[PDB]
Amino acid sequence: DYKDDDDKLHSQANLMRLKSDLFNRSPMYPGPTKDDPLTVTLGFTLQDIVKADSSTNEVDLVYYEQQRWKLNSLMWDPNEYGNITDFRTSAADIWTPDITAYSSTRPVQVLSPQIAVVTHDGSVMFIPAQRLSFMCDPTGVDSEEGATCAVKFGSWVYSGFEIDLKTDTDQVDLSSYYASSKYEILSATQTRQVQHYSCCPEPYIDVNLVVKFRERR
Amino acid sequence: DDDKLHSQANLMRLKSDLFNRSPMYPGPTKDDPLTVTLGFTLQDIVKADSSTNEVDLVYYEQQRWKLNSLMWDPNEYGNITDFRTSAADIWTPDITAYSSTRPVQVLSPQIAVVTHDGSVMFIPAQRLSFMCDPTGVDSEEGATCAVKFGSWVYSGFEIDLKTDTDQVDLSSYYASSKYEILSATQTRQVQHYSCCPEPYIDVNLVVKFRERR
Amino acid sequence: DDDDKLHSQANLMRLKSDLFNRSPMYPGPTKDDPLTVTLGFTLQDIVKADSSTNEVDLVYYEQQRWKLNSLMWDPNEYGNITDFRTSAADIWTPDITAYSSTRPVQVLSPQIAVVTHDGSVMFIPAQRLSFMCDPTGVDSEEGATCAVKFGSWVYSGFEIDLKTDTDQVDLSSYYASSKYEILSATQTRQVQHYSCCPEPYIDVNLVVKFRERR
Amino acid sequence: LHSQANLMRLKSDLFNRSPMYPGPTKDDPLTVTLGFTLQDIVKADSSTNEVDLVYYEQQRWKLNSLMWDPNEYGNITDFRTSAADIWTPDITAYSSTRPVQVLSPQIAVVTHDGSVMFIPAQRLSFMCDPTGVDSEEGATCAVKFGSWVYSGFEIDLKTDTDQVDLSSYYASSKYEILSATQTRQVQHYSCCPEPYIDVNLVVKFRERR
Amino acid sequence: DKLHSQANLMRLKSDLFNRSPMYPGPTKDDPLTVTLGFTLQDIVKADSSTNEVDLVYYEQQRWKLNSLMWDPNEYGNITDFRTSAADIWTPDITAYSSTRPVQVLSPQIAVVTHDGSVMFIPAQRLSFMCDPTGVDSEEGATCAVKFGSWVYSGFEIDLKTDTDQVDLSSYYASSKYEILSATQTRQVQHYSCCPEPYIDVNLVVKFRERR
Ligand SMILES: Nc1nc(Cl)cc(N(Cc2cccnc2)Cc2cccnc2)n1
Ligand SMILES: Nc1nc(Cl)cc(N(Cc2cccnc2)Cc2cccnc2)n1
Ligand SMILES: Nc1nc(Cl)cc(N(Cc2cccnc2)Cc2cccnc2)n1
Ligand SMILES: Nc1nc(Cl)cc(N(Cc2cccnc2)Cc2cccnc2)n1
């Protein structure tokens, strides 16, 4: 109790101590480079197709974007910190990848708190939920065959030389798709793509999110 | 008089002791789990959109939790037993609607009450848009919608939730609302998701309502 | 001539430095040190009355006045400066909130207060507010009636008390070509007990009766 | 080559070290000159009596605390700085219905003689009955601009002319301009004994043929 | 080793951004040339009730500074790096006829190279003044919007385009509008108000409802 109550205060200063050694000694990660490239794992959880505007060809999605990477600058051994194997931290305190939708028509709106989980192996998990408006012609949404749209996500300023992407599966997580949406999902896939762009030798990597959908009935 | 100046210095010194010569509490952990009490006061169903299945709520969200690191002896500070402070000065939980469709809009001052036993009360007023099919809203039966609230980043082993009651407080509901409320419940739930190893805790808010004639 | 202006600038930089730095920001009112805030509304316009959501949009000026010993000074010690203008963020401001707004209040004017050597502050932000209102009858002769309470969010009547100078809302800047004409507008102090709290809260209740301008 | 080191030094001299000006006072009043360049009447709403304008708002004033000698800082006659680095007047539309939207970078020009020029491009919604806009007579609206917290004893207004500059008015606008005037107006009230000043922007306009 | 490349950059950035106080901006004595290019992604919306058209595009900005160059061998063969656009000076290029504030679609990060050149490419959504009369015809509709520095005259900032053709190779295939032509063209003139020369890049786009 008084024992147990001291364990609590102790655990705190341990975390504060770790958060001090990490977030100062070697400062912020300066981003990846070709010498030390970074692999970012990307995955999508589709919650809702909120709106499909046929007068402007924009469709609004609500989804969670799963992001994972690993950095040696964020390694520590849980034995020098009271067995702290991980912590929560504000996402501003750390480097996060500049993953963007390439055909959005409005700035993304964030729906969850901007907080990541860092693990002692220097791995990071960050899952921002957002609402995205993107370019999409919903022709066919009101037929049996439905409509099909696609939006690519990838780094804005880092090529495949500095940032590699991967998905753990090519199936979009549909386990949280809102059952009463105006639209039913016929299928949703997320697929790693590599292209070259004539100019420049460097490759470009994106995860393409394709979605086929129709009015609910 | 030369009394109000003393009490003022006592408050200033108290806040200063708590925030400036001691770090912010880093949040809960497996070894230092936090229980957060939630209670909802529904003020208005402002709008129901059948074209996109979004409904807009205005409500007050009552949050309470208790930290050892915020405790003090009133006797060491001129008998002060509680004070107001900007929510930015302290740790606050990351309670989120899980089916919102727009960033939540805050309607009240971001200020919390801290009490000498280390308890905190924080009650943000909010407008929320969330996923809801209002089909049936123009019948006698009405429409029923649901929205979960819980931590985004902390499992049940770090943040636990409780309610004091399972009835949503309807005593402030706007009488001339376009919608009347048939019932409104807040219910703690523990659920396992494939994404994560640990059970997560939410409070489910289910509202039955209909067009007011 | 020109030397004078420099001096007074120095005097003002000095007064402000003394007030803001030789003692922190006043921590807010307590049960020991309660504050009375005086409120007056100037109704500029009813902009929108949406009957599909029961929301009415108002534009108004909100006069706020209060007074602190901690903002007092001797003008003789400061080149006879009797008052000054300063940013609302340099000072404590009351957390006065509309209890039935439906969207965050939008600020229309610069956030600047006037402090006076007697310790009194005046701060008049212009605002557009959406709040809960049933405009039914706005096309009738008697018109429509709405009410919205203003008061502190976090301070009870033991810490903050409100007051009006009149129960009459100032309509002298009401936009003469508004869609709506004002039949009456009142602002009245109320002592309210809510079942959520053992302490009474004080609010100013803004009652507006209005109808479509013909 | 060194001229970049002179700019740095000047900006440092004027800001860093120099006790930077606390705004105007009765003992030290300020004259702000105001001029509008009307770009477009974008929207006219008969259901809420709101009209939206896009314009450029030119503001000029002058401070001793910002004067310097050119050949004492390597012949520098002027510089650009962020609006946040310096003091700016609190000119506002007295009958807006929505917060103003800023359309231009918030950067001002400072000259060695201590003058500042600031020209924020803005979209403004304000109270206006557009009745008659589809007539030949047209519609008439007005909005006053001026300080919110400084009377005429602390800030005086001027204008270099009472004609609104229309040389950048949008040639294919929904609405054509019949007249646009910007008029200085001294105002004495009643609650108060000090004078007040505003610049009244009157626009007459109608739907384009 | 992989440890070491990282330390070099960190050191390199610190050298540029601490002992080297950033560029206070251009002057009549040392003017700056900024290269502009538009990649037109989509005409989202054409409002004939207010005469506003909404575009989504990428705006390619390129310029060059002595204060930003370095020798890659004094730093471990680092030839470029990325950095928050807030950490450096950027040009205040603005649409001159926008009706609403521009909305930023992409992260605000620039690429700086060892020769001192910078590339910054913000994706944007822009509403601007445009009477879309005839958008529903064979001829289609024509609109223009000028871009340029707000506070720097032709004496301080010069503008150049790479080519006169707007890049259309990323135009949305299923847009509500098809592009008939898109040009970007440097213009210089005097205005009556002022005596300095003014430079802008004028974006002209002809388009029509997709058939
Ligand atoms: N030369 C170039 N041109 C364009 Cl028009 C876009 C582009 N970017 C963004 C970028 C931003 C800042 C610095 N370097 C690159 C990468 C990109 C953009 C769109 C699709 N795929 C990759 N790169
Ligand atoms: N691995 C995972 N995947 C998803 Cl797709 C959501 C999720 N979160 C959010 C989260 C954010 C940051 C750190 N830990 C957890 C928890 C969650 C979200 C929604 C419903 N239930 C649990 N966690
Ligand atoms: N117990 C409690 N419950 C609620 Cl649902 C609100 C509340 N309020 C706000 C309020 C709202 C409406 C009328 N009077 C007061 C007071 C409060 C607010 C923030 C922190 N502590 C107390 N206090
Ligand atoms: N007595 C008083 N009452 C009001 Cl309703 C406004 C006011 N103003 C604002 C104003 C409004 C219209 C034209 N010129 C100025 C001056 C003011 C504003 C803010 C703080 N102190 C004084 N002063």
Ligand SMILES: Nc1nc(Cl)cc(N(Cc2cccnc2)Cc2cccnc2)n1
């Ligand atoms: N005298 C003056 N008057 C105006 Cl109406 C604008 C202006 N501008 C902006 C401009 C915008 C479009 C075309 N040419 C110039 C230049 C400027 C902006 C800010 C501070 N100083 C000069 N300078």
Ligand SMILES: *[C@@H]1O[C@H](CO)[C@@H](O)[C@H](O)[C@H]1NC(C)=O
């Ligand atoms: C955390 O602490 C415990 C001691 O209670 C330790 O034995 C264990 O290895 C740690 N947990 C994990 C998952 O490593």
